[PDB]
Ligand binder design. Structure first.
Ligand SMILES: C#CCNC(=O)[C@H]1O[C@@H](n2cnc3c(N)ncnc32)[C@H](O)[C@@H]1O
Length: 346
């Protein structure tokens, strides 16, 4: 078996000539030559089985990406693992080889307005399909957006994705939350579990801002700091938006803050297209019920050169899990990963 930067890729014989790309807490991504399709691909080695949360993330990714088929969502071409549960220590997810992701890209490249507009269009087009399946991505951020050599963009990961559940969204002040801090909507810190589509729109808003300046717009350094970053730019919420926050601990926290004015988008982004800032304002709206929805956003004048709802497809049916994966043991999740991957056997 080939070995890359310290560990084995049991991906042969179909996939050969591996090259290292990157790694995470419990896996490693390489490129490899697909001997059948005669193209280089990406292979992600995933070793999740020692931990329930790793097993959850892995299963959500596999289950959703296998059901979805959309030009702006990464597909799963193949999955490699051992023929039996006992022998399965890892799973390899094979995908189209992309050139970069938006995180790496923003570290190193200035985007033309044309690129910003095209990237944002593609994010929203992919998100339309996701939301049409009643699915929330819940962790949109630059590193979960892949780009190929011609700047086609594909949303990836889905390890924290859930079925939307607006009737169970309300929670108390400072409720624990998992998704990446800088892309969290203000209501996460106030009264929301992140069970509605508006949570993803906020993240897209943050991504747009970050494309405009190459810097995260709300780089909070801890849970509550995130909210104060948002408020430092948005300013104090209006009386109407406060009256939508019925939980007293959350409302009284906001009431305790000195009056802060809104920082105008054109002072933060003086070189940006004025239509881009108008859409930005609507995505980064404090009140989640007033925040623009994805199909509304696609119809915004900033995107008029791309907008074509007949070319912005939706899912054939809503997505549902067999059961909630929230409280299932890792051994049970391994079973489901095994079953969910059987179709590529062998
Ligand atoms: C685990 C972990 C974190 N590391 C990464 O996932 C390394 O691989 C990326 N990559 C993920 N899919 C990819 C794909 N299909 N084609 C090309 N690069 C890909 C991420 O952009 C990183 O560069």
């Amino acid at each position: 078996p080939e070995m890359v930067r310290g560990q084995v890729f049991d991906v042969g014989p179909r996939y050969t000539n591996l090259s290292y790309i990157g790694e995470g807490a419990y896996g490693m991504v390489c490129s490899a030559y697909d001997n059948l399709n005669k193209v280089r691909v990406a292979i992600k080695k995933i070793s999740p089985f020692e931990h329930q949360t790793y097993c959850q993330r892995t299963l959500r990714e596999i289950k959703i990406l296998l059901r979805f088929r959309h030009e702006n969502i990464i597909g799963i071409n193949d999955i490699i693992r051992a023929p039996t549960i006992e022998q399965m220590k890892d799973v390899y997810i094979v995908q189209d080889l992309m050139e970069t992701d938006l995180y790496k890209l923003l570290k190193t490249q200035h985007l033309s307005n044309d690129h910003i507009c095209y990237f944002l269009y593609q994010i929203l087009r992919g998100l339309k399909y996701i939301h049409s399946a009643n699915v929330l991505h819940r962790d949109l951020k630059p590193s979960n957006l892949l780009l190929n050599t011609t700047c086609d963009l594909k949303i990836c990961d889905f390890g924290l994705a859930r079925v939307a559940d607006p009737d169970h969204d309300h929670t108390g002040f400072l409720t624990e939350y998992v998704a990446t801090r800088w892309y969290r909507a203000p209501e996460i810190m106030l009264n929301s579990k992140g069970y509605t589509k508006s949570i993803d729109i906020w993240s897209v808003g943050c991504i747009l801002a970050e494309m405009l300046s190459n810097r995260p717009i709300f780089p909070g350094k801890h849970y509550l700091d995130q909210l104060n970053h948002i408020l430092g730019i948005l300013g104090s919420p209006s009386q109407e938006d406060l009256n939508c926050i019925i939980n007293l601990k959350a409302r009284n926290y906001l009431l305790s803050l000195p009056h802060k004015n809104k920082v105008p988008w054109n002072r933060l982004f003086p070189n940006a297209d004025s239509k881009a800032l108008d859409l930005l304002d609507k995505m980064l709206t404090f009140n989640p019920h007033k925040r623009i929805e994805v199909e509304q956003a696609l119809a915004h004048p900033y995107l008029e050169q791309y907008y074509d709802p007949s070319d912005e497809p939706i899912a054939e049916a809503p997505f549902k899990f067999d059961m909630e994966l929230d409280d299932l043991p890792k051994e049970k999740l391994k079973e489901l990963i095994f079953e969910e991957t059987a179709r590529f056997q062998p």
